[PDB]
Design a protein around this ligand. Sequence first.
Ligand SMILES: NC(=O)C1CCN(C(=O)Nc2ccccc2)CC1
Length: 460
Amino acid sequence: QPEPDMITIFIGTWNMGNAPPPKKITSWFLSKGQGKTRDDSADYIPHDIYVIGTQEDPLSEKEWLEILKHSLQEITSVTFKTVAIHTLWNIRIVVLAKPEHENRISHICTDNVKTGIANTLGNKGAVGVSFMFNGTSLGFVNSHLTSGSEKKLRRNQNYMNILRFLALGDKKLSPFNITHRFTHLFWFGDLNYRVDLPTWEAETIIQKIKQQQYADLLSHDQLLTERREQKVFLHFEEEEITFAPTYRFERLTRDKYAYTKQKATGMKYNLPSWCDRVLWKSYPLVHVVCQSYGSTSDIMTSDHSPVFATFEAGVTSQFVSKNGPGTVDSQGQIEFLRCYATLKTKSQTKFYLEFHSSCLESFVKSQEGENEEGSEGELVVKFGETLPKLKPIISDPEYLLDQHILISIKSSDSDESYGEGCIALRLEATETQLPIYTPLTHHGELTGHFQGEIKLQTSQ
Ligand SMILES: NC(=O)C1CCN(C(=O)Nc2ccccc2)CC1
């Protein structure tokens, strides 16, 4: 039975509106409704992994597990294994996997972050799950961010708090937040970003939706505009939206957007919006293709419609050689040449690098680089040809070219990271000096750049 090189992952996000679901929700797991939908011919084909994110979920974990498992079994005739379930307040994440994956899945982590302070702490935040699938790390975040058209700044702050404080993945990757810890990261939920148009335009917006004309609406989507100005979700992908806004509906139909201010809304308008979203971020040159992204038309218990997205995702085997794991493979080495970091920092400390990778027995600290003044004010840290030679555990190119090196640049004075990034070893050539490049981030904001040349030696 061969180990896979590809899996399909289903991501669902639904704000249930504190209402139990209808008896049939199979349309969700089949990616049927509006947008980029799944072909009929695939309906009996199970996804390898189903990650279900809910918000305003009124069910017990047991009640929702019963509905989810029975739903998938009806569709696929497969009895899915529960990998993880985590619930913060009414925010919930469920990971289900095909039974043949049970002994491929290990190192399962769960965590939550509560966002806000005093007034604003009590119901918003994120739940998450991470695990290894053979040699591939996977993380999943379900976030319910701050509501309200006039709170996109709050939403961006909620995002930065979740990505700083959600403790998933390999704790040995201590310089690195969840946006660097996984081969594939999926971040979904009721992100709560709104179509920023005047309240007087509501009926015009509704008109535009009935005509399936979304272009002039998406140009005002706060998530799309905030991402374009690099305020939020830096270096995440989102598939093109081709489905009507998923909020706010009158319940028990989809024929009406309920946007007018009411006591129940705190006297706030809820203009039709894409509150309900799936974004991802994969390590450089790993296969990840979105195969669906849409909303259901036929689940109407909530003022939100469910959103599905499906993904082909590249996975690797748990590699064993004669040598590593348990030693180095002297036939392998990773060399950095002519490397410099550019940092936006005003500080004057010395910097050193840390190289972290599952292809190394443990992380490698460099010597300090040489600080220069850049033309336009910047700090440029020069490493030149000083950087330590990295000793992979396995030299087999079938392993090593599928790996990645995480880079942190750290203050000698404080040992704090000023920047994190990632280099793919999926090079055009081995035993050849080749350009490498990663942006550097800290708390998921741009702090600089790292570039140079790599020279990779493999057993071939
Ligand atoms: N949060 C909990 O109560 C857990 C959830 C289920 N579980 C597992 O071990 N699930 C599992 C592990 C590896 C591969 C496939 C499935 C034990 C208890």
